[PDB]
Design a protein around this ligand. Structure first.
Ligand code: TDZ
Ligand code: TDZ
Lengths: 132, 139
């Protein structure tokens, strides 16, 4: 089931991502650089360890994690958060928490695409990736 | 020490570029990296980006060979997939002023010591007596 996600994925469309970063509290200059980037997302599994890398001109990131186990993460916009990632309706669902706030990032397969739905306080961004 | 800013870390915080490399092929040979992969890894000259946010330390390495990133607390064991795809248990401490990382997997172990020496960050990697040395300076 994790293998539905394993691979290299290139970004293909992006909707409401600006509004979403705005709720998150990302600054103006960062919001415009991040918005132009068009990153790859790479997913791998080594045993019970999952790795998501994201790569672009803006920033290279990587989280390594076990499903269902809280871990510390520094996001690309520099929030220090607690994340838990679960497999949930066949989707990887990540909840990020910091300073009383939370955001949910859902990665789900739909046809040959990987759809990423980030939500915070009503504002939903959608980003679609295809295989490389 | 060596050092630094306000913390004993912060001697390490910044962006570093590879400046020289020694016995790195041999080091990789002892670790079990395959012939073809060693050629690509050995020619790469990576940048190393170290940062701190609270108790969390991050070491990023970036090149055409691979982009990796570890996040960790000092003195706390963590799981790590290395650049050459070993899955290891890793512990990193501040010891004689150096960042000393031990990686354990399949009964084996290696030690990466990251130290300051003048304006250089010097990385020494040891596996069964074979030691490699890689020198970095600030970008
Ligand atoms: C700026 C920003 C990003 C990039 C972000 C998230 C948030 C909350 C952000 O404020 C959540 C996950 C996610 C929506 C995951 O899907 C991605 C979307 C954009 C990017 C572009 C930048 S951010 C990163 O880690 N690597 C990149 O190349 C990567 C992954 O990444
Ligand atoms: C291939 C490989 C690497 C790169 C490696 C180590 C091993 C055991 C390796 O098999 C140990 C630490 C160390 C010697 C630390 O210093 C580095 C030297 C080269 C590189 C080049 C590649 S590997 C990476 O994560 N990013 C890069 O750009 C990174 C770090 O990195």
């Amino acid at each position: 089931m994790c293998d539905a996600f394993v691979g290299t994925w290139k970004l293909v469309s992006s909707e409401n991502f600006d509004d979403y970063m705005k709720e998150v509290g990302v600054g103006f200059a960062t919001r415009k650089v991040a918005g132009m980037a068009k990153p790859n997302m790479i997913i791998s599994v080594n045993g019970d360890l999952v790795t998501i890398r994201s790569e672009s001109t803006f920033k290279n990131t990587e989280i390594s994690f076990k499903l269902g186990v809280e871990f510390d993460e520094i996001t690309a916009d520099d929030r220090k958060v607690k994340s838990i990632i679960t497999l949930d309706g066949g989707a990887l669902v990540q909840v990020q928490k910091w300073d009383g706030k939370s955001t949910t990032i859902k990665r789900k397969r739909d046809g040959d695409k990987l759809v990423v739905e980030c939500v915070m306080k009503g504002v939903t961004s959608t980003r679609v990736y295809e295989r490389a």
